[PDB]
Design a protein around this ligand. Structure first.
Ligand SMILES: O=C(O)c1cccc(N2C(=O)C(O)=C(C(=O)c3cccc(C(F)(F)F)c3)[C@@H]2c2cc(Cl)c3c(c2)OCO3)c1
Length: 123
């Protein structure tokens, strides 16, 4: 069976740049997919979207809209020490956390900083 690491690497293979918000979205998709035994359907949706001619970015967003574990789901909370732990290419995508963020509305994750600060990653 495909593993979370395998799928992460497969998805990364299609993305430009490094440590971008889409890379973090792959991390989130793979974590939540692993936790709900859904990596196979996620991989299949990813490949099908690519096969129809969608960009890999569009394919990842479509996974957040078409795979049921992400539908109306809140972004996962990831504990980090400070803003510096977040990759450079993600920094401009960090935003104040809104009232009810949802993964399928583009809120990838919420970083909970050691000093109590909180930042959402937005696509
Ligand atoms: O242990 C697993 O089986 C598994 C599977 C897939 C991905 C991951 N994740 C990681 O190993 C990991 O470093 C994840 C991150 O997204 C992450 C963690 C710390 C810091 C950062 C960073 F700040 F963006 F750099 C990202 C990432 C991760 C993703 C999510 Cl959504 C997490 C999480 C960790 O902990 C709480 O929720 C773990």
């Amino acid at each position: 069976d495909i593993s979370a690491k395998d799928l992460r690497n497969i998805m990364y293979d299609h993305l430009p740049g490094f440590g971008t918000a889409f890379h973090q979205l792959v991390q989130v998709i793979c974590k939540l997919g692993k936790d709900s035994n859904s990596l196979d359907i996620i991989h299949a949706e990813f490949q099908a979207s690519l096969a129809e001619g969608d960009s890999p970015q569009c394919a990842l967003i479509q996974i957040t809209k078409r795979v049921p574990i992400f539908q109306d789901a809140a972004p996962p909370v990831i504990h980090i020490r400070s803003r510096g732990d977040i990759p450079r290419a993600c920094q401009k995508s960090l935003r104040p956390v809104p009232p009810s963020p949802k993964i399928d509305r583009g809120w990838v994750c919420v970083f909970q900083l050691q000093d109590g600060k909180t930042l959402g990653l937005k696509i």
